Ligand SMILES: *[C@@H]1O[C@H](CO)[C@@H](O[C@@H]2O[C@H](CO)[C@@H](O[C@@H]3O[C@H](CO)[C@@H](O)[C@H](O)[C@@H]3O)[C@H](O)[C@H]2NC(C)=O)[C@H](O[C@@H]2O[C@@H](C)[C@@H](O)[C@@H](O)[C@@H]2O)[C@H]1NC(C)=O
């Protein structure tokens with residue numbers, strides 16, 4: 333289509349949102365030039381410009397030098413979660429407005445997401461508590477079934493998303509709680525775990541539940557890339573935990589995967605589905621990786637390690653991600669859940685917040701710089717309150733839906749995310765990037781599967797920083813990174 337620009341609107345915070353409705357939504361180099369996409373606090377939204385690649389460079393300004401031969405992880409991708417709350421919000425819009433929201437995310441005219449996390453039954457971003465097997469003591473799982481949250485809300489929206497998408501989309505599933513008749517405390521929330529011990533009928537049934545969920549989704553012609561072994565297993569170890577959870581120590585998780593979940597999936601028609609362990613705060617690394625992955629019976633089933641961002645302030649990426657990679661380089665690290673406005677003192681939704689967009693890109697760049705292969709936002713959309721949410725655990729979302737007005741707002745988080753998701757396709761590989769002097773920039777460089785280069789530069793300071801990027805193959809890009817800007821640079825080195 334033609335590029336339609338952002339309709340900006342201010343809500344009194346540091347930047348603007350882009351206004352989208354039933355009929356309007358904003359949407360989207362020759363050798364040897366580069367493309368630059370820029371977003372700024374002042375209001376630019378992924379604006380395209382071009383520049384020449386020079387042969388020479390002189391000066392003592394900041395130089396960032398690509399090391400195309402230092403090769404690191406391959407990227408799996410970027411996306412968000414299709415919760416009950418996200419489905420209810422999107423379906424609240426008229427169908428044309430719904431198409432423009434899905435296109436914003438999934439289409440090539442939008443920012444190209446290729447990952448969708450799907451909860452297995454209810455979480456806090458549900459308006460009802462339920463599992464797929466609520467009939468008590470149904471150990472055979474005869475009464476297992478998907479309710480309308482799945483069959484009328486989530487499943488059809490995931491289908492629209494795959495139809496709009498240019499890139500292959502990977503589905504990732506995670507459970508919050510099991511049926512309560514499987515749990516020590518008999519409740520969806522609170523402190524409690526599976527009854528018994530791995531290897532027994534409870535653990536066997538819980539592993540069969542995963543296969544039943546996959547069978548059920550496959551009947552609706554949806555197939556999964558990966559499942560996690562539990563969302564935030566540490567939560568269910570905490571007294572009074574307020575919403576759906578299921579606690580595992582790392583030993584409990586090791587032995588569940590070894591004796592029940594890994595063999596159950598390996599013996600099912602879904603043996604190709606990857607299993608991710610942890611799915612919890614990175615400060616749990618490297619300890620959890622060492623407990624699970626040094627048992628060869630558990631390690632043979634574990635494809636990767638899922639991390640969440642909520643305690644990153646306590647957990648230096650080098651001592652957590654870097655050290656895990658050093659010990660277990662062949663087990664991919666993947667960021668599976670992030671959102672702002674989740675601390676009890678923070679405002680849930682701050683329409684137009686630039687700070688919250690910068691938190692997203694700063695996290696993404698730091699994760700890429702420490703071997704992480706992908707990054708998943710939480711709810712795809714929320715209402716202006718940051719809900720619905722059965723326990724009022726409201727948070728922020730890159731897209732806020734205003735149903736009484738059939739309109740949605742794209743926040744700075746949406747664009748900060750798009751500066752990566754749009755321009756780093758599955759298969760791209762991170763390469764070296766070194767700075768000539770101390771600076772306030774955050775930057776990462778990658779190579780696309782066709783060998784072209786992509787560099788994202790975030791300026792977290794208020795000062796404009798002139799800089800040059802050196803590609804030792806090709807030449808020099810002379811540029812400036814304005815204070816509170818994010819830029820993505822692209823060029824063919826072919
Ligand atoms: C969906 O969102 C679009 C984009 O904002 C709305 O269309 C826009 O309406 C604007 C104001 O209503 C128009 O801009 C104005 O231009 C006029 C003269 O041309 C000036 O008097 C004024 O100062 C404004 O700047 C503009 O035509 C249009 N914007 C774009 C870029 O398309 C739209 O509103 C619905 O259609 C438009 C064309 C208006 O006439 C509305 O009143 C109309 O109901 C939004 N749709 C809905 C349902 O609100």
Ligand SMILES: *[C@H]1[C@H](O)[C@H](O)[C@@H](O)[C@H](O)[C@H]1O
Nearest residue numbers: 455456563564669674727
């Ligand atoms: C991750 C975060 O705690 C988020 O706020 C919460 O809503 C999810 O349920 C949890 O898994």
